[PDB]
Symmetry: C2
């Protein structure tokens, strides 16, 4: 809920995307191929997010 | 919690953006120009999102 207390839209969208993807890894057995396929994006894409956020 | 339960990333991002903007609109009493500046985007952009995300705007 702290997300709604963030000022900038673009900051709040990253923080959310970081939480969503990290909370996703834990519920998908930290597998990139699996996670990427099941959150609806590519591997090269998910990988380029894992570094830009985590 | 509504959000984390969402399957796809592109869909959960839209729902968060919708909720984020709704609440920012509320706390700035639906002053569009002020809301846009506060959250770091152009009014024209904020308005595109308002329409795309199907957000209701009140206050006179
Ligand atoms: Zn800042
Ligand atoms: Zn599945
Ligand atoms: Zn301000």
């Amino acid at each position: 809920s702290y997300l709604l207390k963030i000022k900038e839209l673009k900051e709040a969208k990253k923080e959310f995307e970081k939480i969503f993807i990290e909370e996703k890894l834990r519920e998908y057995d930290y597998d990139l191929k699996r996670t990427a396929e099941e959150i609806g994006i590519d591997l090269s894409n998910l990988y380029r997010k894992i570094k830009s956020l985590n």
